[PDB]
Design a protein around this ligand. Structure first.
Ligand SMILES: CCCCCCCCCCCCCCCCCC(=O)OC[C@H](COP(=O)([O-])OCC(O)COP(=O)([O-])OC[C@@H](COC(=O)CCCCCCCCCCCCCCCCC)OC(=O)CCCCCCCCCCCCCCCCC)OC(=O)CCCCCCCCCCCCCCCCC
Ligand SMILES: CCCCCCCC/C=C/CCCCCCCC(=O)O[C@H](COC(=O)CCCCCCCCCCC)COP(=O)(O)OCCN
Lengths: 115, 53
């Protein structure tokens, strides 16, 4: 029924090419020092593989090992992730997340922390 | 000639080493210099931006 409705409403839509250039990744640093703000944000990432690659699975396993943390998280010192237990134990940060941002044939694999 | 040797037996050995020191330094001076430039490239390249509201 969905397919019928598609045919009924969308079929006038043109299909007659913007394709995506590779995107070059660069090892680099951008630092907006603004002492007047009360906490520091840092995001760090390596070039990731991109949507299609089977490595994204193993990478997400690894990211999950390391994890995410927030100063409301109940787990604290006893947490499974060493990053998180250590960050809780020693008040190293308010929060952090690992991420694997995916694009066509590239990506950002890393972590952001606020501290 | 004998009186030079008598005063400085080392004359020949020293001159051999001189050569090997000059050679090693020919290698090592541009090498380490290159290492220096590499590390410092982060800083040499950097661009500064002042951006008050
Ligand atoms: C009487 C006694 C004296 C009193 C003192 C004695 C006390 C004891 C010693 C204590 C020493 C204290 C000094 C501390 C310094 C520590 C380092 C430091 O802080 O920075 C370095 C300081 C500046 O560093 P920098 O990053 O250039 O800073 C640039 C500034 O930002 C400015 O930027 P810029 O863009 O305006 O700069 C322009 C640039 C450009 O202007 C130039 O003059 C260009 C000419 C460059 C010469 C060749 C370059 C070599 C490699 C580059 C490749 C391209 O000039 C420079 O970079 C200036 C530095 C010196 C120039 C390089 C050496 C010239 C020698 C020429 C030899 C030619 C043959 C080379 C082949 C090598 C193979 C054997 O430079 C020096 O003081 C020179 C040291 C490095 C020289 C090594 C190069 C190799 C030379 C040949 C070796 C041969 C060995 C023996 C014979 C071999 C037989 C086989
Ligand atoms: C705790 C360890 C300390 C080690 C220090 C590290 C030195 C780092 C820098 C090195 C500079 C590079 C130039 C060195 C040239 C060496 C060439 C060479 O083999 O020369 C040595 C003598 O040189 C020499 O004897 C020249 C050596 C010059 C080094 C002097 C600086 C250190 C001062 C030592 C004072 C206690 C002997 O040559 P030969 O007698 O033909 O022997 C044949 C090969 N075994």
């Amino acid at each position: 029924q969905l397919l019928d409705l598609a045919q009924k409403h969308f079929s006038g839509l043109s299909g007659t090419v913007p394709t995506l250039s590779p995107c070059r990744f660069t090892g680099s640093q951008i630092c907006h020092r603004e002492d007047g703000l009360p906490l520091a944000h840092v995001a760090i990432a390596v070039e990731g593989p991109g949507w299609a690659h089977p490595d994204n699975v193993a990478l997400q396993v690894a990211n999950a090992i390391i994890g995410h943390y927030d100063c409301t998280y109940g787990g604290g010192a006893h947490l499974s992730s060493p990053l998180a237990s250590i960050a809780a134990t020693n008040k190293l940060c308010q929060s952090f997340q690992t991420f694997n941002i995916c694009y066509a044939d590239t990506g950002l694999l890393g972590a952001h922390f606020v501290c | 000639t004998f009186l030079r040797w008598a005063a400085e037996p080392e004359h020949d050995h020293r001159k051999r080493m001189g050569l090997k020191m000059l050679l090693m330094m020919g290698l090592l001076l541009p090498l380490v210099y290159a290492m220096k430039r590499h590390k410092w490239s982060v800083l040499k390249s950097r661009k500064l931006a002042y951006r008050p509201p």
